[PDB]
């Protein structure tokens, strides 16, 4: 029952030393990070999960660069930031699954040659 400011697609280049996949929540009422649980996926399983109750970032070997900024997780921003290394490798449909306590919404966004 969470709402987002949608973003259908985002573009990257090789000039982009890092890439951002935006995901914003407009109605998250959590006042602390213990209450938030984020889960990003791309064509299947969880590239990135952050368990706010334990503050444990988990990343596959092939997404060791992926990260979010927790200092604005309460402000509604849980956008993944990686680099072209694992961006050029992996381009497709990424999904932002955010959970605050009992409620939960989700959104998906799309991830230019010369």
């Amino acid at each position, epitope marked *: *029952q969470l709402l987002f400011n949608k973003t259908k697609s985002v573009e990257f280049t090789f000039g982009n030393d890092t890439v951002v996949i935006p995901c914003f929540v407009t*109605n998250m009422e959590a006042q602390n990070t213990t209450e938030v649980y984020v889960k990003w996926k791309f064509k299947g399983r969880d590239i990135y999960t952050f368990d706010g109750a334990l503050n444990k970032s988990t990343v596959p070997t092939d997404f060791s660069s992926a990260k979010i900024e927790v200092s604005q997780l309460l402000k509604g921003d849980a956008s993944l930031k990686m680099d072209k290394s694992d961006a050029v490798s992996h381009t497709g449909n990424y999904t932002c699954e955010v959970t605050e*306590l*009992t*409620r939960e919404g989700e959104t998906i966004i799309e991830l230019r040659v010369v």
Partner: antibody, heavy 117, light 113 residues
Framework: QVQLVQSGAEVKKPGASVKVSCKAS????????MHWVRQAPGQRLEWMGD????????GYNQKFKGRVTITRDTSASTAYMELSSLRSEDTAVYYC??????????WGQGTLVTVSS | DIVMTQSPLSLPVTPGEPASISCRSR???????????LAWYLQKPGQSPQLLIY???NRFSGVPDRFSGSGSGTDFTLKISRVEAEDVGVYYC?????????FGGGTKLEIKR
């Protein structure tokens, strides 16, 4: 303060209908999902349905197929629940329950309707 | 409807001792999403229900560290480190995977003074 206030207790004869209010305060009405739970003796508590106040979508328990209607009013931040053609099986305390897609995190007083002649 | 069974139906415990409540389901409550939403509730004497554990083992805002949930698919169990006089009441397991959502019978907690 997150607080949910419903209407008072009621009395109906079998074959009639009852509509129980649930006014919500302390939060933004359409930010959460709202459920309806009842405790009838001597059975378990029974999830009867839900309503999402933003879109108005609903999902019901087909145990009550054809006789429950969960309605919505955001102008007053009040959700409603109608149960038609009553019998001695439905006399119970009806709980209006706020929460997410699959859990309720705050509940109301409870509405005890007695169906009797 | 997915039946859910709890045991015991009543549990005498002196405060300071553990107390475990189990609630099993005929068929698994794992959803397509690969999450299993089992929520533990308690109806305090004279007061409407309140939530303690959501999603098998995640506690609610304001619940002490002493209420912990576990279990997988079929079997689940609600455990507490120690019970206190404030914990009196009856506890419900609740499934959040398949419509219709169902509740458990109810394990009633009694304090031994």
């Amino acid at each position: 303060q997150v607080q949910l206030v419903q209407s008072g207790a009621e009395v109906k004869k079998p074959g009639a209908s009852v509509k129980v209010s649930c006014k919500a305060s302390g939060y933004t009405f359409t930010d959460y999902n709202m459920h309806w739970v009842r405790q009838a003796p001597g059975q378990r508590l029974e999830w009867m349905g839900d309503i999402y106040p933003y879109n108005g979508g609903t999902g019901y328990n087909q145990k009550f197929k054809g006789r429950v209607t969960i309605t919505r009013d955001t102008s007053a931040s009040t959700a409603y629940m109608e149960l038609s053609s009553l019998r001695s099986e439905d006399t119970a305390v009806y709980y209006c329950a706020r929460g997410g897609w699959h859990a309720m995190d705050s509940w109301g007083q409870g509405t005890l309707v007695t169906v009797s002649s | 409807d997915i039946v859910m069974t709890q045991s015991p139906l009543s549990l005498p415990v002196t405060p300071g001792e553990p107390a475990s409540i189990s609630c099993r389901s005929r068929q698994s409550i794992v959803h397509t999403n690969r999450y299993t939403y089992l929520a533990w509730y308690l109806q305090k004497p004279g007061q409407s229900p309140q939530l303690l554990i959501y999603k098998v083992s995640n506690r609610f805002s304001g619940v002490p560290d002493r209420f912990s949930g576990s279990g997988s698919g079929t079997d689940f169990t609600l455990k507490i480190s120690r019970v206190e006089a404030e914990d009196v009441g009856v506890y419900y397991c609740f499934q959040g995977s398949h419509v219709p959502y169902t509740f458990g019978g109810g394990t009633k907690l009694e304090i031994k003074r």
